[PDB]
Amino acid sequence: LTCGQCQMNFPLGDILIFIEHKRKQCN
Numbered sequence: 001l002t003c004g005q006c007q008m009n010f011p012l013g014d015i016l017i018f019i020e021h022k023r024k025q026c027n
Protein backbone atom coordinates (compact mmCIF):
# COMPACT_ATOMS: atom_id res chain seq x y z
CA LEU A 1 0.00 0.00 0.00
CA THR A 2 1.02 3.64 -0.50
CA CYS A 3 0.31 6.50 1.90
CA GLY A 4 0.74 10.16 0.99
CA GLN A 5 1.19 11.18 4.63
CA CYS A 6 4.23 8.93 4.99
CA GLN A 7 4.98 9.06 1.25
CA MET A 8 6.04 5.41 1.02
CA ASN A 9 5.20 2.41 -1.19
CA PHE A 10 4.80 -1.20 -0.05
CA PRO A 11 4.65 -4.51 -2.01
CA LEU A 12 1.75 -6.97 -1.85
CA GLY A 13 1.53 -8.72 1.51
CA ASP A 14 2.69 -5.70 3.51
CA ILE A 15 -0.73 -4.14 4.09
CA LEU A 16 -0.37 -4.85 7.81
CA ILE A 17 2.35 -2.20 8.04
CA PHE A 18 0.11 0.43 6.42
CA ILE A 19 -2.56 -0.06 9.08
CA GLU A 20 -0.02 0.38 11.88
CA HIS A 21 1.20 3.70 10.46
CA LYS A 22 -2.35 4.99 10.04
CA ARG A 23 -2.97 3.70 13.55
CA LYS A 24 -0.84 5.88 15.84
CA GLN A 25 2.06 6.95 13.61
CA CYS A 26 -0.08 8.71 11.00
CA ASN A 27 -1.93 10.74 13.64
Ligand SMILES: [Zn+2]
Binds near residue numbers: 006
Ligand atom coordinates in the same frame (compact mmCIF):
# COMPACT_ATOMS: atom_id res chain seq x y z
ZN1 LIG B 1 0.71 7.60 6.69
